[PDB]
PDB file of N, CA and C in Angstrom:
ATOM      1  N   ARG A   1      34.590 -33.778 -51.130  1.00 48.59           N
ATOM      2  CA  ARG A   1      33.293 -33.657 -50.417  1.00 48.59           C
ATOM      3  C   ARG A   1      32.189 -33.331 -51.420  1.00 48.59           C
ATOM      4  N   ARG A   2      32.340 -32.221 -52.132  1.00 50.74           N
ATOM      5  CA  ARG A   2      31.335 -31.800 -53.124  1.00 50.74           C
ATOM      6  C   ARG A   2      31.187 -32.834 -54.232  1.00 50.74           C
ATOM      7  N   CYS A   3      29.975 -33.290 -54.448  1.00 50.84           N
ATOM      8  CA  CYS A   3      29.717 -34.283 -55.490  1.00 50.84           C
ATOM      9  C   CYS A   3      29.309 -33.596 -56.789  1.00 50.84           C
ATOM     10  N   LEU A   4      30.167 -33.691 -57.784  1.00 49.54           N
ATOM     11  CA  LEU A   4      29.911 -33.080 -59.083  1.00 49.54           C
ATOM     12  C   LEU A   4      28.639 -33.642 -59.709  1.00 49.54           C
ATOM     13  N   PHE A   5      28.301 -34.868 -59.362  1.00 47.66           N
ATOM     14  CA  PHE A   5      27.104 -35.510 -59.885  1.00 47.66           C
ATOM     15  C   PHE A   5      25.855 -34.948 -59.234  1.00 47.66           C
ATOM     16  N   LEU A   6      25.842 -34.860 -57.901  1.00 46.76           N
ATOM     17  CA  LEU A   6      24.704 -34.355 -57.168  1.00 46.76           C
ATOM     18  C   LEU A   6      24.519 -32.863 -57.435  1.00 46.76           C
ATOM     19  N   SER A   7      25.618 -32.157 -57.717  1.00 41.50           N
ATOM     20  CA  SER A   7      25.549 -30.720 -57.993  1.00 41.50           C
ATOM     21  C   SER A   7      24.803 -30.477 -59.327  1.00 41.50           C
ATOM     22  N   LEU A   8      25.084 -31.330 -60.325  1.00 41.83           N
ATOM     23  CA  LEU A   8      24.456 -31.213 -61.624  1.00 41.83           C
ATOM     24  C   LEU A   8      22.948 -31.359 -61.498  1.00 41.83           C
ATOM     25  N   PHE A   9      22.528 -32.227 -60.583  1.00 42.56           N
ATOM     26  CA  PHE A   9      21.115 -32.451 -60.346  1.00 42.56           C
ATOM     27  C   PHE A   9      20.482 -31.272 -59.605  1.00 42.56           C
ATOM     28  N   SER A  10      21.324 -30.493 -58.954  1.00 41.19           N
ATOM     29  CA  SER A  10      20.848 -29.328 -58.201  1.00 41.19           C
ATOM     30  C   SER A  10      20.480 -28.165 -59.140  1.00 41.19           C
ATOM     31  N   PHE A  11      21.204 -28.029 -60.221  1.00 39.03           N
ATOM     32  CA  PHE A  11      20.946 -26.993 -61.193  1.00 39.03           C
ATOM     33  C   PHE A  11      19.580 -27.191 -61.866  1.00 39.03           C
ATOM     34  N   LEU A  12      19.140 -28.459 -61.917  1.00 40.61           N
ATOM     35  CA  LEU A  12      17.883 -28.783 -62.523  1.00 40.61           C
ATOM     36  C   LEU A  12      16.729 -28.378 -61.598  1.00 40.61           C
ATOM     37  N   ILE A  13      16.985 -28.471 -60.293  1.00 43.45           N
ATOM     38  CA  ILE A  13      15.986 -28.096 -59.297  1.00 43.45           C
ATOM     39  C   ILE A  13      15.877 -26.589 -59.152  1.00 43.45           C
ATOM     40  N   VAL A  14      17.040 -25.908 -59.215  1.00 39.51           N
ATOM     41  CA  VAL A  14      17.073 -24.459 -59.068  1.00 39.51           C
ATOM     42  C   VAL A  14      16.400 -23.809 -60.279  1.00 39.51           C
ATOM     43  N   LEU A  15      16.467 -24.437 -61.421  1.00 41.40           N
ATOM     44  CA  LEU A  15      15.869 -23.907 -62.644  1.00 41.40           C
ATOM     45  C   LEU A  15      14.364 -24.209 -62.670  1.00 41.40           C
ATOM     46  N   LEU A  16      13.993 -25.441 -62.338  1.00 42.75           N
ATOM     47  CA  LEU A  16      12.608 -25.871 -62.327  1.00 42.75           C
ATOM     48  C   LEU A  16      11.785 -25.011 -61.369  1.00 42.75           C
ATOM     49  N   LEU A  17      12.443 -24.559 -60.299  1.00 43.83           N
ATOM     50  CA  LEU A  17      11.794 -23.710 -59.301  1.00 43.83           C
ATOM     51  C   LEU A  17      11.632 -22.284 -59.792  1.00 43.83           C
ATOM     52  N   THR A  18      12.700 -21.713 -60.345  1.00 46.19           N
ATOM     53  CA  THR A  18      12.674 -20.350 -60.862  1.00 46.19           C
ATOM     54  C   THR A  18      11.633 -20.182 -61.951  1.00 46.19           C
ATOM     55  N   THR A  19      11.263 -21.287 -62.589  1.00 46.62           N
ATOM     56  CA  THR A  19      10.272 -21.274 -63.672  1.00 46.62           C
ATOM     57  C   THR A  19       8.889 -20.919 -63.129  1.00 46.62           C
ATOM     58  N   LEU A  20       8.450 -21.688 -62.121  1.00 46.82           N
ATOM     59  CA  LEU A  20       7.135 -21.500 -61.534  1.00 46.82           C
ATOM     60  C   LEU A  20       7.136 -20.322 -60.535  1.00 46.82           C
ATOM     61  N   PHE A  21       8.123 -20.309 -59.649  1.00 47.71           N
ATOM     62  CA  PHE A  21       8.234 -19.267 -58.654  1.00 47.71           C
ATOM     63  C   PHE A  21       8.177 -17.857 -59.285  1.00 47.71           C
ATOM     64  N   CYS A  22       8.726 -17.745 -60.515  1.00 45.28           N
ATOM     65  CA  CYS A  22       8.716 -16.476 -61.202  1.00 45.28           C
ATOM     66  C   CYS A  22       7.318 -16.143 -61.702  1.00 45.28           C
ATOM     67  N   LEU A  23       6.591 -17.157 -62.113  1.00 43.86           N
ATOM     68  CA  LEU A  23       5.209 -16.960 -62.618  1.00 43.86           C
ATOM     69  C   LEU A  23       4.255 -16.627 -61.485  1.00 43.86           C
ATOM     70  N   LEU A  24       4.589 -17.104 -60.283  1.00 41.13           N
ATOM     71  CA  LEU A  24       3.779 -16.867 -59.101  1.00 41.13           C
ATOM     72  C   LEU A  24       4.031 -15.440 -58.534  1.00 41.13           C
ATOM     73  N   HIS A  25       5.288 -15.030 -58.588  1.00 43.76           N
ATOM     74  CA  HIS A  25       5.681 -13.725 -58.048  1.00 43.76           C
ATOM     75  C   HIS A  25       5.303 -12.597 -59.045  1.00 43.76           C
ATOM     76  N   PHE A  26       5.720 -12.747 -60.283  1.00 42.40           N
ATOM     77  CA  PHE A  26       5.442 -11.731 -61.311  1.00 42.40           C
ATOM     78  C   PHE A  26       3.939 -11.556 -61.496  1.00 42.40           C
ATOM     79  N   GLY A  27       3.155 -12.607 -61.184  1.00 42.63           N
ATOM     80  CA  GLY A  27       1.712 -12.530 -61.316  1.00 42.63           C
ATOM     81  C   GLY A  27       1.296 -12.471 -62.768  1.00 42.63           C
ATOM     82  N   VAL A  28       2.096 -13.052 -63.665  1.00 40.72           N
ATOM     83  CA  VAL A  28       1.832 -13.076 -65.101  1.00 40.72           C
ATOM     84  C   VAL A  28       0.349 -13.300 -65.377  1.00 40.72           C
ATOM     85  N   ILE A  29      -0.081 -14.542 -65.146  1.00 39.53           N
ATOM     86  CA  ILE A  29      -1.489 -14.923 -65.367  1.00 39.53           C
ATOM     87  C   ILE A  29      -1.932 -16.006 -64.359  1.00 39.53           C
ATOM     88  N   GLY A  30      -1.076 -16.292 -63.406  1.00 41.63           N
ATOM     89  CA  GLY A  30      -1.366 -17.297 -62.419  1.00 41.63           C
ATOM     90  C   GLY A  30      -0.802 -16.943 -61.037  1.00 41.63           C
ATOM     91  N   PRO A  31      -1.308 -15.858 -60.411  1.00 43.45           N
ATOM     92  CA  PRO A  31      -0.845 -15.449 -59.085  1.00 43.45           C
ATOM     93  C   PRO A  31      -1.406 -16.315 -57.966  1.00 43.45           C
ATOM     94  N   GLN A  32      -0.914 -17.523 -57.847  1.00 44.80           N
ATOM     95  CA  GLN A  32      -1.344 -18.435 -56.809  1.00 44.80           C
ATOM     96  C   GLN A  32      -0.520 -18.275 -55.536  1.00 44.80           C
ATOM     97  N   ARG A  33      -0.296 -17.030 -55.130  1.00 44.10           N
ATOM     98  CA  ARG A  33       0.479 -16.754 -53.941  1.00 44.10           C
ATOM     99  C   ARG A  33      -0.288 -17.075 -52.685  1.00 44.10           C
TER     100      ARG A  33
END
């Protein structure tokens, strides 16, 4: 059931999100909340 290929693409989305989401939450220099 679990697709090892689709899963690999998921890690890229989870990381790409944590990059911006962290900058928005932490309020580093761009708190666009």
